[PDB]
Amino acid sequence: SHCQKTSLRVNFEDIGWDSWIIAPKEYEAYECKGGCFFPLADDVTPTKHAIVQTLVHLKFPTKVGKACCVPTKLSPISVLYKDDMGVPTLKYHYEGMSVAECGCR
Amino acid sequence: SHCQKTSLRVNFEDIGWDSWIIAPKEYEAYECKGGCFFPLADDVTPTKHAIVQTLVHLKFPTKVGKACCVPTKLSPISVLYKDDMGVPTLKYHYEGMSVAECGCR
Ligand SMILES: [Cl-]
Ligand SMILES: [Cl-]
Ligand SMILES: [Cl-]
Ligand SMILES: [Cl-]
Ligand SMILES: [Cl-]
Ligand SMILES: [Cl-]
Ligand SMILES: [Cl-]
Ligand SMILES: [Cl-]
Ligand SMILES: [Cl-]
Ligand SMILES: [Cl-]
Ligand code: NA
Ligand code: NA
Ligand code: NA
Ligand code: NA
Ligand code: NA
Ligand code: NA
Ligand code: NA
Ligand code: NA
């Protein structure tokens, strides 16, 4: 039950972006969920600082928070958007929209 | 009160690393602390996914967790360590030990 990519389907109208995004209506953003506690998995790929903070958090749980399961690499998607003039326009690689990799940081 | 680098002084014996680290006894690791909620600061430098997840978390706080204030760039330190033979040896750039930048991810 450690840090990993799980599914997260995002509807653009729900987050108030339908005003400038015609299509798609929903996309697969994924999310990173899970713990960063010891012992770790063989593919968490954690930084030295995340390891140190996890140890410090264990010894002082009230003073220092835990490390975090976050996206460590993102992928683009394509969106059809009405530009400032108002015409549908394709953005082929809308960067940073979907999780490619998760990790403890 | 948004995501920012705050101080975190780490003692190597407290985290059980004194067995292979002779010096220094403590170092300044810093940590990233604060919220990732709207409105954001001019220097959070958040990814598109962190922005999307924050919106989804606002609309569905029980199903989707918040974005995270984590280190986005790390700096090295120097440590004196007894090697596998047992002699003090300098590691000049022990990478990923201290926070250089924080951000919402
Ligand atoms: Cl481990
Ligand atoms: Cl590292
Ligand atoms: Cl593009
Ligand atoms: Cl291409
Ligand atoms: Cl982009
Ligand atoms: Cl904002
Ligand atoms: Cl991005
Ligand atoms: Cl080095
Ligand atoms: Cl150098
Ligand atoms: Cl290193
Ligand atoms: Na949604
Ligand atoms: Na949905
Ligand atoms: Na404590
Ligand atoms: Na292509
Ligand atoms: Na400590
Ligand atoms: Na200390
Ligand atoms: Na909810
Ligand atoms: Na140098």
Chain A residues in contact with B71 (beta carbon < 8 A) = 47, 49, 105
Chain B residues in contact with A71 (beta carbon < 8 A) = 47, 49, 105
Residue B15's contacts (CB-CB under 8 Å, 6 or more residues apart) are A52, A55, A56, A59
Residue A64's contacts (CB-CB under 8 Å, 6 or more residues apart) are A53, A56, A57, B8, B31
Domain membership of residue B69 as a residue range:
4-104
Query: Distance from the CA of A25 to the center of ligand 12, in angstroms?
Result: 10
The separation between the first and the last C-alpha atoms of chain A, rounded to the nearest angstrom, is: 17
Experimental approach was X-ray
For residue A37, the one-letter residue type is F
Chain A residues in contact with B64 (beta carbon < 8 A) = 8, 31
For residue B78, the one-letter residue type is S
**Residue located via tokens 């780490």:** B10
**Residue located via tokens 């999310």:** A31
Q: What six digits make up the tokens of A80?
A: 């059809």
Q: What six digits make up the tokens of A8?
A: 């997260």
Sequence-ordered strand ranges (E) for A1-105:
4-6, 9-11, 26-28, 31-33, 69-82, 88-104
Q: Say which ligand is closest to the CA of A95.
A: 5
Residue B18, domain CATH:
2.10.90.10
H-helix or E-strand containing B82? strand B69-82
Please answer whether residues A63 and B98 qualify as being in contact, where contact means their C-beta atoms are separated by less than 8 angstroms: no
**Angle at the Cα of B28 (from A73 to B79), degrees rounded to 5?**
90
Nearest to A50 by CA among A63, A59, A37: A37
Q: How many helices (H) and strands (E) does chain A have?
A: 1, 6
Per the structure, how many domains does chain A have?
1
CB atoms within 10 A of CB B11: 14
Nearest to A52 by CA among B4, B27, B88: B27
Shortest CA distance from B71: residue in chain A: A105
H-helix or E-strand containing B103? strand B88-104
